[PDB]
Amino acid sequence: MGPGTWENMAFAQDSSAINNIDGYLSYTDWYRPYGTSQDGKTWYKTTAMDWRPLLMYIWPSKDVQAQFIKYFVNNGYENANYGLTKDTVANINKDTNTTVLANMAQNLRYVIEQSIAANKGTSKLANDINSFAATVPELSASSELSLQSMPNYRPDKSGTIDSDQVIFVNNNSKDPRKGNTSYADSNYRLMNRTINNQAGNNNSDNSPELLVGNDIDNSNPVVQAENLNWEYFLLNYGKLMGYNPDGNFDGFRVDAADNIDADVLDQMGQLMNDMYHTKGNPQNANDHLSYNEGYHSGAAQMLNEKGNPQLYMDSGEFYTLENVLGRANNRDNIGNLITNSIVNRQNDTTENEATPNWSFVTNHDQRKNLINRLIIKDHSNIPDIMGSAYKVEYANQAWQEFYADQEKTNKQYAQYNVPAQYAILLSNKDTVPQVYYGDLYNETAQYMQEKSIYYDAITTLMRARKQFVSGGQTMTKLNNNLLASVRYGKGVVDANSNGTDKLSRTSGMAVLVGNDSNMAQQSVAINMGRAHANQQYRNLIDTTENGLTYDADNSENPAILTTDSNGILKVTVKGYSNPYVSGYLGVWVPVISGDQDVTTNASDVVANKEKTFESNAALDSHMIYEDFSLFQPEPTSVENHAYNVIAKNASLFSDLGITDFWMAPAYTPFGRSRYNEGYSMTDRYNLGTTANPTKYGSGEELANTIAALHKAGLKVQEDIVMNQMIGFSGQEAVTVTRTNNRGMQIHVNGQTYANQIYFAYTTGGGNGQETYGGKYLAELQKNYPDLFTTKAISTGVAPDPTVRINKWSAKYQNGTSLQNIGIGLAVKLANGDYAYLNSGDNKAFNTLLPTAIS
Numbered sequence: 001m002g003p004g005t006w007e008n009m010a011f012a013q014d015s016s017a018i019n020n021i022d023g024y025l026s027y028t029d030w031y032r033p034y035g036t037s038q039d040g041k042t043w044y045k046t047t048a049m050d051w052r053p054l055l056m057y058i059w060p061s062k063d064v065q066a067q068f069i070k071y072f073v074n075n076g077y078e079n080a081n082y083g084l085t086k087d088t089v090a091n092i093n094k095d096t097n098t099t100v101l102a103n104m105a106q107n108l109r110y111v112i113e114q115s116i117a118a119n120k121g122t123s124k125l126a127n128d129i130n131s132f133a134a135t136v137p138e139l140s141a142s143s144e145l146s147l148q149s150m151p152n153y154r155p156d157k158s159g160t161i162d163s164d165q166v167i168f169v170n171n172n173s174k175d176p177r178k179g180n181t182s183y184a185d186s187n188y189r190l191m192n193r194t195i196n197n198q199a200g201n202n203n204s205d206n207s208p209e210l211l212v213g214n215d216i217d218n219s220n221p222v223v224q225a226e227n228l229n230w231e232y233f234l235l236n237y238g239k240l241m242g243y244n245p246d247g248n249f250d251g252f253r254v255d256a257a258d259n260i261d262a263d264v265l266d267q268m269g270q271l272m273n274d275m276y277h278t279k280g281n282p283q284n285a286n287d288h289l290s291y292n293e294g295y296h297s298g299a300a301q302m303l304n305e306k307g308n309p310q311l312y313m314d315s316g317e318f319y320t321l322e323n324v325l326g327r328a329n330n331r332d333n334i335g336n337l338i339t340n341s342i343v344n345r346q347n348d349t350t351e352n353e354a355t356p357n358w359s360f361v362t363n364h365d366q367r368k369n370l371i372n373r374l375i376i377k378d379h380s381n382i383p384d385i386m387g388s389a390y391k392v393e394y395a396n397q398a399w400q401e402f403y404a405d406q407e408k409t410n411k412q413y414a415q416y417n418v419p420a421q422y423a424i425l426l427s428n429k430d431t432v433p434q435v436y437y438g439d440l441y442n443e444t445a446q447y448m449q450e451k452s453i454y455y456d457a458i459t460t461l462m463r464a465r466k467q468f469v470s471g472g473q474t475m476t477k478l479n480n481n482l483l484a485s486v487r488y489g490k491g492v493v494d495a496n497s498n499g500t501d502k503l504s505r506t507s508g509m510a511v512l513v514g515n516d517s518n519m520a521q522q523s524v525a526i527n528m529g530r531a532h533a534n535q536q537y538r539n540l541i542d543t544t545e546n547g548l549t550y551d552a553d554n555s556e557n558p559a560i561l562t563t564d565s566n567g568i569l570k571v572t573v574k575g576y577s578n579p580y581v582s583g584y585l586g587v588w589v590p591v592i593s594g595d596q597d598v599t600t601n602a603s604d605v606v607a608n609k610e611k612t613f614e615s616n617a618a619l620d621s622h623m624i625y626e627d628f629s630l631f632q633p634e635p636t637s638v639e640n641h642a643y644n645v646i647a648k649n650a651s652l653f654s655d656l657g658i659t660d661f662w663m664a665p666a667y668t669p670f671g672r673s674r675y676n677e678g679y680s681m682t683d684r685y686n687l688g689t690t691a692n693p694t695k696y697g698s699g700e701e702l703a704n705t706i707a708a709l710h711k712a713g714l715k716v717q718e719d720i721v722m723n724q725m726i727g728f729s730g731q732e733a734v735t736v737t738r739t740n741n742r743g744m745q746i747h748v749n750g751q752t753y754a755n756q757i758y759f760a761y762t763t764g765g766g767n768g769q770e771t772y773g774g775k776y777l778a779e780l781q782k783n784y785p786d787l788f789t790t791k792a793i794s795t796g797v798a799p800d801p802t803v804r805i806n807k808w809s810a811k812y813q814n815g816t817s818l819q820n821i822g823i824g825l826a827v828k829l830a831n832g833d834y835a836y837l838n839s840g841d842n843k844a845f846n847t848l849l850p851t852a853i854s
């Protein structure tokens with residue numbers, strides 16, 4: 001033919017001239033037409049570099065075509081000579097005649113080609129297309145139907161939106177109206193097999209499958225084998241990388257244990273017993289301490305029934321501590337500290353009975369909830385403030401407000417009675433307590449550079465624990481708002497024991513806590529036990545008008561008091577109100593001359609063939625340290641990499657009685673993630689290089705840090721994160737449905753969608769996954785064949801080591817939180833059929849394209 005409008009056709013019907021996603025077309029993608037023109041008269045053939053946006057040629061409707069013409073004429077593509085002025089376009093809409101819309105669009109393409117010529121490139125055009133697309137609901141975030149759009153929405157302090165999800169469903173249809181994404185089909189995706197619902201027949205926990213990100217299908221037997229690979233890797237990190245050969249993790253902090261198929265918890269425990277013989281061997285179990293993060297109390301029962309392969313997280317204790325001691329007003333009664341925990345501590349005088357557990361005053365997420373509350377307070381009328389309208393400047397403002405408020409007596413945001421919360425935590429029996437980095441240090445400064453105001457109080461309590469805390473526990477109300485928590489000492493079982501250990505006489509502790517700042521002054525009697533008659537006690541911590549004293553300076557009691565002939569200690573107390581105490585805090589320990597360490601060895605406790613973890617004096621001797629904050633800043637030098645600062649201070653952590661060091665998730669972070677902390681990772685096996693460190697440092701540094709912690713006598717756990725990955729660079733065409741956090745379809749303001757092609761980011765994993773994914777499966781099968789013959793509960797089948805995961809894609813994923821791309825990107829023709837490019841491996845339908853690009 002002669003030259004003309006037919007040159008709008010695609011240069012060729014394949015991937016060399018039409019971008020596509022598994023054969024489907026996206027309205028925001030570009031294509032190479034055969035030719036282009038600036039006036040409709042002279043037409044120029046296209047080089048391989050001359051690509052154009054599809055939104056110049058096709059649209060999902062007449063409405064959107066009219067908006068496009070309108071928008072471009074109002075943003076630099078006005079030309080009176082081609083019938084395109086602000087006046088000529090002001091009234092056009094979906095009901096404008098078809099032939100004049102097509103004419104206006106053709107003339108606009110000429111006007112656009114003139115702009116491309118003038119600007120010597122498509123750079124401005126590309127920005128104008130992106131700016132236009134953001135104003136069209138079906139081509140942008142709002143059509144995904146966020147809960148944030150609801151009238152008078154209240155943002156959630158968690159900073160995630162639980163019900164903003166989509167599931168990936170099967171679709172092997174031959175109907176072009178439904179499309180086909182069969183490469184992403186699965187025989188698994190068993191969702192919500194969480195905690196006691198592992199077998200699908202007890203949802204008394206109602207714990208959700210979905211949190212945030214791309215949710216991994218931990219019911220897929222190939223995925224379950226890959227988790228064993230990943231565990232084995234981390235447990236031998238340093239020697240498998242050729243880095244420090246003692247730079248190997250000893251165990252795991254298990255992220256999101258309530259939100260993944262519980263099979264993986266059974267399987268992790270099995271692996272670690274195969275490798276280290278933990279079951280029935282407290283010394284081996286305790287050397288490989290592992291503990292599960294969760295806020296559902298039903299996990300205690302689950303873990304007991306399983307023989308306790310990991311520690312239960314006692315969140316009840318945290319909420320009790322905050323409700324009793326931490327509020328400004330409407331404090332719960334002091335007695336709740338006795339009863340409202342997974343362990344009742346009224347008179348706790350036995351061992352191997354309580355649910356093995358870990359407890360805390362603060363963790364990284366709880367500090368975040370406070371900071372996000374503050375952000376929401378500071379910037380009301382911004383409903384999506386916790387989603388896409390979040391700005392780091394709001395966090396900075398909140399942190400400045402927090403540090404100021406933390407120093408006040410009348411705190412508006414920060415917790416009251418932080419020292420007393422710790423005094424209870426670190427004296428409690430039948431728990432492994434967990435101290436938070438950000439309660440010892442100002443967590444937004446460079447790593448460990450600024451001590452927190454609570455550093456002195458908490459570190460005093462930490463050292464005394466190692467020296468003194470052992471034996472039975474009794475907690476007793478002395479009045480309606482004040483309590484004494486007493487430990488009787490190593491080898492002292494209860495208040496009536498004489499003591500059976502050489503350290504019995506000189507160990508034990510009394511912690512006095514009240515939560516009424518107006519409490520009248522009075523005397524109180526504390527029962528130290530029969531092993532502690534006529535004995536001198538030191539005033540470790542007492543309260544003063546302005547704070548705490550560590551040497552009985554200007555407090556109600558002197559530096560030493562002595563018990564009577566029955567073991568009763570007599571003490572004076574009253575209510576105070578200062579930045580450290582709202583109520584009262586007192587701590588008493590026996591006076592001693594030298595060093596003392598009351599740790600009980602695991603070789604000396606009762607072994608039980610059916611238990612891994614047992615709550616006894618040996619396990620109680622452990623203390624966990626959370627080494628990070630979400631708001632930890634990017635380092636300013638190699639010397640300030642957390643890993644190097646940590647290695648340098650190894651002896652400090654040992655001196656504070658820390659036995660188990662919880663290291664942040666060390667994985668390569670998604671660069672655009674909110675915090676760059678490691679839970680939003682793109683590569684599960686790359687833990688940073690010298691050229692490209694993570695927030696915390698390089699892999700080589702990590703291995704040296706672990707070795708240095710081992711040299712100081714500590715064991716080290718890695719935060720293992722099976723639930724989600726975030727930041728995949730590869731898009732895939734998936735078939736999806738709008739759901740809540742359990743994968744059940746919902747409506748949002750009366751609207752919904754189901755079985756729709758969505759161009760989600762799903763594919764990636766980095767070179768770490770390529771190299772290390774499944775690498776160790778052959779050897780694990782050779783050494784521990786039972787791992788791949790034991791039928792898992794949720795599926796009834798063993799993990800499958802015959803397939804290696806070198807690259808993640810949707811077939812291994814349950815779904816995703818909303819990705820802010822739009823549900824209408826997928827090109828449909830007028831009749832509703834999906835457009836499709838039959839090329840290469842994409843054979844699902846015959847090539848079918850819009851008529852505008854022939």
Ligand SMILES: OC[C@H]1O[C@H](OC[C@H]2O[C@H](O[C@H]3[C@H](O)[C@@H](O)[C@@H](O[C@H]4[C@H](O)[C@@H](O)[C@@H](O[C@H]5[C@H](O)[C@@H](O)[C@@H](O)O[C@@H]5CO)O[C@@H]4CO)O[C@@H]3CO)[C@H](O)[C@@H](O)[C@@H]2O)[C@H](O)[C@@H](O)[C@@H]1O
Pocket residue numbers: 158159160161212213214365368386387672673674675677679680725726727728729761762816817818819820
């Ligand atoms: O073209 C731009 C960009 O596009 C792609 O990336 C899109 C990305 O979308 C999805 O991930 C986003 C997610 O859906 C959002 O909810 C949001 O996640 C936030 C949380 O909202 C936030 O609270 C926090 O989460 C942490 C918790 O607070 C904490 O308690 C603990 O549990 O750790 C959590 C994990 O960090 O931070 C996350 C992360 O910011 O933002 C997400 C994206 O930032 C989808 O899952 C991703 O796979 C998609 O990549 C391209 O990938 C990208 O290359 C391109 O530049």
Ligand SMILES: OC[C@H]1O[C@@H](O)[C@H](O)[C@@H](O)[C@@H]1O
Pocket residue numbers: 030048049050051
């Ligand atoms: O942004 C669209 C881009 O698509 C690529 O496939 C082309 O090679 C680029 O020249 C073009 O600009």
Ligand SMILES: [Ca+2]
Pocket residue numbers: 208209210211215216259260261723
């Ligand atoms: Ca999950």
